[PDB]
Design a protein that fits this description.
Chain C: Belongs to the ATPase alpha/beta chains family. Chain C: It comes from Toxoplasma gondii (strain ATCC 50853 / GT1). Chain C: One of its GO terms (cellular component) is proton-transporting ATP synthase complex. Chain C: Produces ATP from ADP in the presence of a proton gradient across the membrane. Chain C: Its main location: membrane. This is part of a larger assembly, with two copies of chain A, one copy of chain B (51 residues) and two copies of chain C. Chain A is α/β, with parallel strands linked by helices. Helix content of chain A is 32%, strand content 19%. Chain A folds into three domains: 74 residues, no CATH class; 284 residues, no CATH class; 121 residues, no CATH class. In chain A, helix 4 packs across helix 5, helix 9 crosses helix 11 and helix 9 crosses helix 13. Chain A starts with a strand and ends with a helix. Chain B is an all-alpha fold and 51 residues long. The longest helix of chain B has 48 residues. The radius of gyration of chain B is 22 Å and the shape is rod-shaped. In chain C, the strands form four sheets. A six-stranded antiparallel beta barrel of chain C has the order 1-2-5-4-3-6. Chain C has a five-stranded parallel beta sheet with strand order 8-12-11-13-14, with helices on both faces. In chain C, strands 15-10-16-17 form a four-stranded mixed beta sheet, with no helix packed on it. The chains are: A alpha/beta (479), B mainly alpha (51), C alpha/beta (512). At the A-C interface, strand 4, helix 6 and helix 9 of A face strand 1, helix 5 and helix 7 of C.
């Protein structure tokens, strides 16, 4: 082991001097003589046997000349079936207060992406039980999915619904990575996973625990943590998933909350690391730092990782560099809007911004493709009458246009559905709408076999039977 | 007939006022564009010279 | 502030009278490393744009020569490099192979294949940054490219030697337009033995991911399209210098077809990721920035890249190099720096929109903003005869579009324009990976402009067209061969066409 | 002098001399590689080191590479031998027809004319075009904006202006392409060789004989780096100042775009490290535009008129580039495809066009009256068209139909053929003096020729030919 | 006093101060005078140029903070001396070009906060025919 000396300290940036045998970049250094464990990640070489590193924990209490030890390898996270059912930090340390991780192996969070020769697989269809998703933006079994949206549109709620509707039925394992989200949300997710059998903790008389089963792993780099942790926790979780992909050959799920924090946590330190800011304050190394991550998330001929990333969109501006660059890295897209959530239409998915590589006639049949495109045409036709309606009024519209508006409003209310995790907001029970049911209902509504029904019979349903039941109830209560 | 004549006159006046408002908003838009550009560029320069 | 020569290991030699400067101009020592950049002391003699090689086999390009150091950009990660390593010159400027060995092959920005099929034969290796052709060697554009799309081949024609920008928003059909342009050349290359009437294709990708590069390669291998094209892939994992160099490598690969009397079409996908990479390399080489932090050498960059697209004269060989750069606009604003620089550099514009991609108008080409500074000079007369009419008809529709929601109250001479515009707009719609030939295009547009679709329900036109196509390809192949050979729509062929149309309408029955 | 390169940062070359440093703007020639490289000094730094902007690419350069100092700035050749030729910023030809055998050379950086050597008497420029000489009169020593792209007849307007000014004023002309497309330059060269603006006759031995032509060309190609495109207009301006000063002629100077001049200046300032101004433009914007445009003026010997094409980015006339250029512009000439669609050529919009010379002091108080009358008539006809679009042309009074008739008659009268378009059309060319145009407009507005038909005005260049066409169309 | 566009920026910066120094002789000798700076926005542009070339930090519209001081140094010299200081005078008619009639910009407001009045001119009245195109509701004194 080499030995170095801290030279200066600036926020989350630490300069270190070695007398000999400099460490390669990205290596891990341990500070000696500190209260708690403190790890530094090499980021740059400056000259004169000096390096510049990023601290995982707070630098408060650090002293110049304090001693530092190189580990000879980057941040190694433990791996195996022992991480399952368990929460982990950016440096692999557990924060569940249940004991240490008895893992027989460790992987470096920094790896090289799979090459072009390692091709993907067929575009497998993923059934989530959500209507607008299964219809207009089908999710792929082996590809990346994006949930773009600001604050208060239902991102973590949608991820929780996807977890309830996918992870429990999934036979392989699963991973969650909280990158700069709320701790209340982390506690709620942990409690709900312990409740719904996704985690199976069994305490023992000798004080130990047993997480047998528990097909889930959790990693957290939350807001309280400094930069350096929020950036590398995604690599940590992605290595934890790459282990299950490569060796065990399993199919894996990978949920990530607020990946945008990664970029923010770069921009927080780049100017201290001596880089010039980019257009709107972001770092120059935005696209490369994001692609080195995303390219590691891909299906290969040994396994598959289905990823779901929630992307904060500040001020509802999709032109920001971070989401602008992230859009190109995704197979499936789902953009949430405030103008729709104001109408009580939850999930507040914009079907005119949501897209998918899968929506093609060769993958999904023409009954699905033509239905989706007809729905989108109808909604655009309805959008192209808003000004005429606001200025003149419905009196000027022909009966064709009134039929169009009615059907578009009915589709809008019908794409809404109640989730199981939103009971504590709506009180209503949750629904699971299969895809043939969705296609039948959409074909019926577009064909015109429900114009006799009212419009308020749609905003909480999961099919046509429930629509007819709600209309029946409203007609009985009308007299 | 009088109603329809007044309607045509009102549409004329509304189109004229809309053209005026479009001119004003175009001026304001160009001003705000230049302001945004200058602000972003001064931010970049001060961050480049603060090293 | 200290220089690499002033560090406290060399001054112990200089003070001690050591004169061991016999270290050649070939070898240098690393001083600093970070973010894909290296800084060396020595190599007084290295050229700008020259390749250098590190201890661990990796290589890089020397860009920022300085009085005290040398700035190097790395083709890879920084884990391999550490301070104190040695760097040696290769002595050769960055270059790439050229030849028929690249047809049907995927390669990186340096010719190194990534298909996993074998090495690449190369009798010729060409430089990457070269001088463009002058004025006298060039020739005026007088030949079409035949993208295979109706709207493009009719209203926004693309010629051989042109530079037609494909600008639009995300998920509009740009890669689809490119792949259709690639696929339409199959019948023309398979229907000829000479390598002067064919058109080869090069597809440079920048910033794309492999899980879609592979889908593109799959789609072209399904249709046997790779035999006359080649891919250059500089993805997001590949470093910024490689994303920056891939378009120049593609232009180098196409100059072989240009100079040798052949024809190529090169397709730069995500040039904005090129400019992005250049910015990422300038802000890390500490170069002075501009607005949006882009350096001043961006216009010069895209200009060097695009000014190689040309049409050479009959004394140079008669070759050509068409260009179809692609650009994503983040809000439709084409007044930004990179859009304004590229529209200023290019010979045209194909503006795709998102409001029309969902109205069923696919390709979502807005022919109002789409233009072509070449024009009818890049069109056969058979297409001129219908396009000169359809342009006026669609302009009138664009003049009377808002009245579509009030046509019940209007009078004749204004509903006919709406009807013809709607019929033509529903005719120009097209299916993904299903391009047509120019003869069929001429026939269908004659059926459209000559009023054989006004009294129909628009929803049936997609049937109409299809049936008519099958009918003519079953019955009147002579008409198509005559239009393809003479490149004209004479009165006799027009009478034959009207006869076939009347026969088709008589044989078939439509809604309205 | 002889110096050595010390470092190379893109288009920014830092050079070290041992003694007698070169002044700023001087030229330096690099020695030790092909593609002759020229560097223009821009800044001294100390340690006997200077900074230079390259006119060509810097790839393949080496530190310690030798450099020679020419001892003066970029020197372009001048003479009647530059007529019909093309030249780059460094004066070299790129037309593949031989070297320029000129007996003289002028620097591109020349001081503007002083306050004494300047003409106080303004005067129009007799072009020969009716709409131009009527509603937007040009001036000697003036600077005319030309807002218009393709599909409008701009190249033909250019060639007609060149030919008419060469025939009448006896003055040659110059065209500068500031970062223009190469195929566009080739098209312009071939159009000139077709229309007779250039006379490239082969000789027996294999040389060329550029006999009496009417235009020199100076092209800074878009593939050229920043530093050339910024110093091209100065090259063409010196080429024109040669004709102005010595030959004593009234010459022209066409500029393909001044916004690319501004782009190049901004780029060069960003490379050299100058802090950009409001919207990214350089802090030496108005200063550079003045160093250029203050040489385009009249003197006691001759004159230089100039026709600059302008591009307003994002339709923002408040942008610093056009806001600084319109201060120097003495006129304006807008084109439109909405008049070319009517078959009218030149497609000059008589309403959008403006001029500072239309006031009733230079042109007398009859030109002004006729012009304002025609503008009033065309505005009234515009309003009547907007009305007829709705209410139809049946609800018009007789005075309204008379106004419509006169408006269409003068809108088609202003059209005329071109001497250069003869080879394209066969219809001959028609020069039209200004008194003749004034009389024709007076009659058309008085209502005398209301009995004539419509299409009798579209083709002609005077009332005589209009009445003759009407007499022959009656048959 | 001529400092034209071909002339360097320091000379445009100076020329107003040189004219004011030439007028101070009339102001201090009991005589009366009037200076007409036909362009102060160009002086401000030249000062912005010199500052950015001196690496000074820009501000609003890239103009530095010493523009108010720049114009006020010059305009505060215009004065009517008293009975015991000779009785001379020095008026001042500074001129400003606007862009689309915007007077809510930085330089027009900086000079309106220094001046004792305002004579406004419009392009509408000048295109109609009213010349001099001096508005009267916006012009004050």
């Amino acid at each position: 082991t080499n030995h170095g000396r801290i030279t200066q300290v600036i926020g989350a940036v630490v300069d270190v001097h070695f007398d000999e045998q400099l460490p390669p970049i990205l290596n891990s250094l341990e500070v000696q003589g500190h209260t708690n464990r403190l790890v530094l990640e090499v980021a740059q070489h400056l000259g004169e046997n000096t390096v510049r590193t990023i601290a995982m924990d707070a630098t408060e209490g650090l002293v110049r000349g304090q001693k530092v030890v190189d580990t000879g390898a980057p941040i190694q996270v433990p791996v195996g079936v022992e991480t399952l059912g368990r929460i982990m930090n950016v440096i692999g340390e557990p924060v569940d207060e249940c004991g240490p991780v008895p893992a027989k192996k460790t992987y470096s969070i920094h790896r090289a992406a799979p090459l072009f020769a390692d091709q993907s697989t067929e575009p497998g269809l993923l059934q989530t039980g959500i209507k607008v998703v299964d219809l207009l933006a089908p999710y792929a079994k082996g590809g990346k999915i994006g949930l773009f949206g600001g604050a208060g549109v239902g991102k973590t709620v949608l991820i929780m619904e996807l977890i309830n509707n996918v992870a429990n039925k999934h036979g392989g394992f699963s991973v969650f990575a909280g990158v700069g989200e709320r701790t209340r949300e982390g506690n709620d997710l942990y409690h709900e996973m312990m409740t719904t059998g996704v985690i199976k903790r069994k305490k023992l008389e000798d004080g130990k625990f047993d997480f047998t089963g528990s097909k889930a792993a959790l990693v957290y780099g939350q807001m309280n943590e400094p930069p350096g942790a929020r950036a590398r926790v995604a690599l940590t979780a992605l290595s934890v998933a790459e282990y299950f992909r490569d060796e065990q050959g399993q199919d894996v799920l990978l949920f990530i909350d607020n990946i945008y924090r990664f970029t923010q946590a770069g921009s927080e330190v780049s100017a201290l690391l001596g880089r010039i800011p980019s257009a709107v304050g972001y770092q120059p190394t935005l696209a490369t730092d994001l692609g080195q991550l995303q390219e590691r998330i891909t299906t290969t001929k040994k396994g598959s990782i289905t990823s779901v990333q929630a992307v904060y969109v500040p001020a509802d501006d999709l032109t920001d560099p971070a989401p602008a660059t992230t859009f190109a890295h995704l197979d499936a897209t789902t953009v949430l809007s405030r103008q729709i959530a104001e109408l009580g239409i939850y999930p507040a998915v914009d079907p005119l911004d949501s897209t998918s590589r899968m929506l093609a006639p060769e993958i999904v049949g023409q009954e699905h493709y033509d239905t989706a495109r007809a729905t989108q045409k109808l909604l655009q036709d309805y959008k192209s009458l808003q000004d005429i309606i606001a200025i003149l009024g419905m009196d000027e519209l022909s009966e064709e246009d009134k039929l169009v508006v009615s059907r578009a409003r009915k589709i809008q209310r019908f794409l809404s559905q109640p989730f199981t995790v939103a009971e504590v907001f709506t009180g209503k029970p949750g629904r699971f709408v299969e895809l043939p049911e969705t296609i039948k209902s959409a074909q019926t509504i577009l064909r015109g076999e429900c114009d006799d029904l009212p419009e308020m019979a749609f905003y909480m349903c999961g099919g046509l039977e429930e629509v007819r039941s709600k209309a029946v109830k409203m007609a009985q209560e009308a007299a | 007939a009088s109603e329809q004549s007044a309607r045509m006159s009102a549409m004329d006046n509304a189109s004229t006022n809309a053209g005026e408002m479009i001119s004003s908003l175009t001026l304001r838009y160009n001003r705000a564009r230049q302001a945004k550009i200058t602000t972003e560029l001064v931010e970049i320069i001060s961050g480049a010279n603060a090293l | 502030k200290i220089s690499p020569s002033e560090m406290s290991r060399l001054l112990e030699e200089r003070i001690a009278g050591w004169k061991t400067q016999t270290s050649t101009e070939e070898v240098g020592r690393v001083v600093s490393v970070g973010d894909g950049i290296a800084r060396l002391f020595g190599l007084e003699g290295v050229q700008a744009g020259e390749l250098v090689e590190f201890q661990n086999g990796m290589t890089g390009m020397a860009l920022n020569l300085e009085t005290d150091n040398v700035g190097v950009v790395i083709f890879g990660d920084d884990r391999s490099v550490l301070e104190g390593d040695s760097v040696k010159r290769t002595g050769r400027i960055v270059d790439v192979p050229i030849g028929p060995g690249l047809l049907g092959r995927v390669v990186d920005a340096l010719g190194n294949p990534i298909d996993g099929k074998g090495p690449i034969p190369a009798k010729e290796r060409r430089r990457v940054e070269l001088k463009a052709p002058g004025i006298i060697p060039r020739k005026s554009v007088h030949e079409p490219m035949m993208t295979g799309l109706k709207c493009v081949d009719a209203l926004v024609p693309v010629g051989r030697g042109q530079r037609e920008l494909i600008i639009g928003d995300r998920q509009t059909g740009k890669t689809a337009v490119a792949v259709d342009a690639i696929i339409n050349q199959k019948e023309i290359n398979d229907s000829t033995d000479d390598e002067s009437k064919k058109l080869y294709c090069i597809y440079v990708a920048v910033g794309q991911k492999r899980s879609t590069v592979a889908q593109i390669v799959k789609a072209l291998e399904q249709r046997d399209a790779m035999k006359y094209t080649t891919v250059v892939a500089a993805t997001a994992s590949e470093a910024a210098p490689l994303q920056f160099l891939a378009p120049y490598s593609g232009c180098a690969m196409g100059e072989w077809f240009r100079d040798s009397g052949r024809h190529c079409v090169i397709i730069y996908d995500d040039l904005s990721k090129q400019a992005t990479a250049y910015r990422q390399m300038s802000l890390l080489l500490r170069r002075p920035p501009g607005r949006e932090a882009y350096p001043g050498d961006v216009f010069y960059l895209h200009s060097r890249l695009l000014e190689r697209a040309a049409k050479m004269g009959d004394k140079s060989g008669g070759g050509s190099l068409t260009a179809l750069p692609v650009i994503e606009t983040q809000a439709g604003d084409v007044s930004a720096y990179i859009p304004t620089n590229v529209i200023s550099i290019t010979d045209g514009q194909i503006f795709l929109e998102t409001e029309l991609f969902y109205k069923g108008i696919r390709p979502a080409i807005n022919v109002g903003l789409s233009v072509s500074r070449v024009g009818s000079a890049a069109q056969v007369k058979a297409m001129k005869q219908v396009a000169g009419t359809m342009k006026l008809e669609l302009a009138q529709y664009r003049e009377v579009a808002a009245f579509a929601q009030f046509g019940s109250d209007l009078d004749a001479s204004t509903r006919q324009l709406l009807t013809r515009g709607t019929a033509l707009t529903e005719l120009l719609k097209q299916r993904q990976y299903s391009p047509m030939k120019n003869s069929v295009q001429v026939c269908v547009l004659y059926c459209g402009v000559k009023g054989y679709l006004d009294p129909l329900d628009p929803k049936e036109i997609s049937r109409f067209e299809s049936l008519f196509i099958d009918y003519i390809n079953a019955n009147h192949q002579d008409i198509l061969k005559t239009i393809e050979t003479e490149k004209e729509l004479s009165e006799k062929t027009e009478a034959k066409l009207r006869a076939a149309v009347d026969e088709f309408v008589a044989m078939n029955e439509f809604k309205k």
